């Protein structure tokens, strides 16, 4: 079924959620300069980009699987659009996890 795909991309977001939690806990606490803050933000985006290519690599595999199954071609098309929407949602939340990892005015750091 497509439930395999829905959980596949949902598994990536949970991993990103755990990975970004440990990322935040290891950021320097206290009064930081400002150059240091963007250094934190580029790493959060670098970590989000790595988690996102795992999503796309998985998206390409299932698409190859969808086209190669003995189903009606109009059923290839909609399944390809739903699995694309699953991966798009996964990439959006991963981006949201990276942004909120360096959110201003939390307990962590300040200027």
């Amino acid at each position, epitope marked *: 079924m497509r439930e395999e795909a829905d959980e596949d991309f949902k598994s990536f977001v949970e991993a990103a959620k755990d990975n970004f939690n440990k990322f935040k806990a290891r950021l320097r606490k206290g009064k930081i300069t400002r150059e240091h803050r963007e250094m934190m933000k580029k790493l959060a985006k670098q970590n989000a980009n790595k988690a996102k290519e795992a999503v796309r690599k998985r*998206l390409s595999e299932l*698409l*190859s699987k*969808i*086209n*190669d*199954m*003995p*189903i*009606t*071609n*109009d059923q*290839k*098309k909609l*399944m*390809s*659009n739903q*699995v*694309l929407q699953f991966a798009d949602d996964a990439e959006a939340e991963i981006d949201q996890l990276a942004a909120k990892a360096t959110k201003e005015f939390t307990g962590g750091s300040w200027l």
Partner: antibody
Amino acid sequence: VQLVESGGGLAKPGGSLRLSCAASGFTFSPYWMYWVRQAPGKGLEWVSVINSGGGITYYTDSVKGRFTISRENAKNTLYLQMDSLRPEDTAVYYCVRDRTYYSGVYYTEDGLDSWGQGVLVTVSS
Amino acid sequence: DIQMTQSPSSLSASVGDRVTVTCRAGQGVSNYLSWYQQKPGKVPKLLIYKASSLQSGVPSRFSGSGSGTEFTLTISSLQPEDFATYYCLQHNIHPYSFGQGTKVEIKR
């Protein structure tokens, strides 16, 4: 963006031939591939199908067990091993590409759009 | 494989006439019906895919219609070079299957 076919010709009843189909100019891996034959003066009809290097293969009733459609995506070549040839196997054989693939952001569904020049298989003693 | 039933087996028509070729599928094929033109001793040429989509470079006088199990190729104004056998093809589900072919002859 052509397909060239090899093999075929004259073969005695019960003998074996095998058709090659070298693809070029495009992406051979993701598309389903067809072998279509046309007996002299008669209509078109599919004979064998295969996926993107997968294990799903179709064969028409006239050819079960005898012919085996092989495929690899490295050399970009399609195959049709033809064993136990019978007088009604006389036809022009074409290898065709199904330009159908769905990627979500983009898709094509032209169907069987690119054909080989054809090859004549003659079965006679 | 779905069984395609095309009619007529052959027909004759004058230059400038409107020609109609009918194709019928055993099961529903939705929008995935193709029309091919084959002239003597030549590779079949895809004219129309998706029943009503014209391939690149195909003359405008060719047009298809229908969806479900009833389809119709239409040549609005027959030309001398339109002499050929026309086949319908469902590309909805593998294996794709052809019709019997319609042999079009020119009256002059």
